[PDB]
Amino acid sequence: HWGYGKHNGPEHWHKDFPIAKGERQSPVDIDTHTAKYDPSLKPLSVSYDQATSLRILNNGHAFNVEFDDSQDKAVLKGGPLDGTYRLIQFHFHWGSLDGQGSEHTVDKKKYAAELHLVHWNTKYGDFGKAVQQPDGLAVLGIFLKVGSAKPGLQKVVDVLDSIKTKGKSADFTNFDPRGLLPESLDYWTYPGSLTTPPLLECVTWIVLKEPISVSSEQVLKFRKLNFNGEGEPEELMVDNWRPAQPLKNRQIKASFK
Ligand SMILES: Oc1cccccc1=S
Ligand SMILES: [Zn+2]
């Protein structure tokens, strides 16, 4: 099955998931000089005051922090979006080394990691139906650089010990994803896809310009996770990023001059 190795990594995904070579794949390189300012874009509205986290899961490719998405809490709207999109989960993609790990790049620069807050369009009723639609998802993407620690990340870091291996989950309540957001909501946006199989073309990407800083110690703990299950040869969960894909017939819009 797919993964991030020599024999099952991103260059192989197209055999099981032919949309890998589709017209709106992600990630992409954001060429900052080509991305045009769009003064019609609205400020992004991130309303996370009532977010209810449930659980954290090692799914064998990343860890997901999952939310209660059964009520109208934790919503993204405005920006490029029509309507309201509900937070279901966040996860990260990260490197074996500080010099790589992000999926989007900015003028070819790779950050150490990238946070994806995944939201589904409420008009489609749930996540499963939303991923069948070209406007089903909105992913807020946030870069991570290594420097100062992010205090609001530490609760996540500390639970990772308990989900080392594929299939492990742990209760994870009362986590506030507002502590993972930079000051500015200035963003780039374009139409794309999930960055993991099934690579569905449902996503309005909203990539924040301003990175967050995390410490070396915090990212080191991400790199202690395992892609394997308990009782299997250890393969560290590192370099779970898809590289940049062809832009094809797309424009990247900037919310800011
Ligand atoms: O990596 C992903 C996994 C699953 C669902 C939605 C979005 C992304 S980027
Ligand atoms: Zn992702």
Curated annotation (Swiss-Prot):
Alphabetically list the UniProt keywords.
Acetylation, Cell membrane, Cytoplasm, Disease variant, Lyase, Membrane, Metal-binding, Osteopetrosis, Phosphoprotein, Zinc
Q: Which InterPro entries match?
A: CA_dom, CA_dom_sf, Carbonic_anhydrase_a-class, Carbonic_anhydrase_a-class_CS
Record-linked Gene3D superfamilies: Alpha carbonic anhydrase
**What mutagenesis or variant effect is reported for residue 59 to H?**
Reduced proton transfer
EC numbers, comma separated: 4.2.1.1, 4.2.1.69
The annotated consequence of residue 103 to D reads:
Normal CO(2) hydrase activity
- What subcellular compartments does it reside in? Cytoplasm; Cell membrane
CDD domains (UniProt xref): alpha_CA_I_II_III_XIII
Enumerate the Gene Ontology biological process terms.
angiotensin-activated signaling pathway; carbon dioxide transport; morphogenesis of an epithelium; neuron cellular homeostasis; positive regulation of cellular pH reduction; positive regulation of dipeptide transmembrane transport; positive regulation of synaptic transmission, GABAergic; regulation of chloride transport
Q: Which Pfam families match?
A: Carb_anhydrase
Detail which positions bind Zn(2+): 91, 93, 116
Question: How is the enzymatic or functional activity of this protein modulated?
Answer: Activated by X-ray, histamine, L-adrenaline, L- and D-phenylalanine, L- and D-histidine, L-His-OMe and beta-Ala-His (carnosine).
For activity, the cofactor(s) needed are: Zn(2+); Co(2+)
Record annotation: effect of changing residue 91 to C/D/E/N/Q: Strongly reduced CO(2) hydrase and p-nitrophenyl acetate esterase activities, impaired stability of zinc binding
The enzyme's first-digit EC class, named in words, is lyase
Q: Which PROSITE patterns match?
A: ALPHA_CA_1, ALPHA_CA_2
> This chain belongs to which protein, by name?
Carbonic anhydrase 2
Annotated site (Involved in the binding of some activators, including histamine and L-histidine), which positions? 89
The site annotation (Fine-tunes the proton-transfer properties of H-64) covers 4, 59, 64
What's the further remark here?
A: Target of drugs used in treatments against glaucoma disorder and breast cancer.
GO terms for MF? arylesterase activity; carbonate dehydratase activity; cyanamide hydratase activity; zinc ion binding
State the family it belongs to.
Belongs to the alpha-carbonic anhydrase family.
Quaternary assembly: Interacts with SLC4A4. Interaction with SLC4A7 regulates SLC4A7 transporter activity. Interacts with SLC26A6 isoform 4 (via C-terminus cytoplasmic domain).
Keyword Lipid metabolism listed = no
- What does the annotation give as the result of altering residue 4 to F? Enhanced activity
Mutation: residue 195 to A/C/H/P; reported impact is: Strongly reduced activity
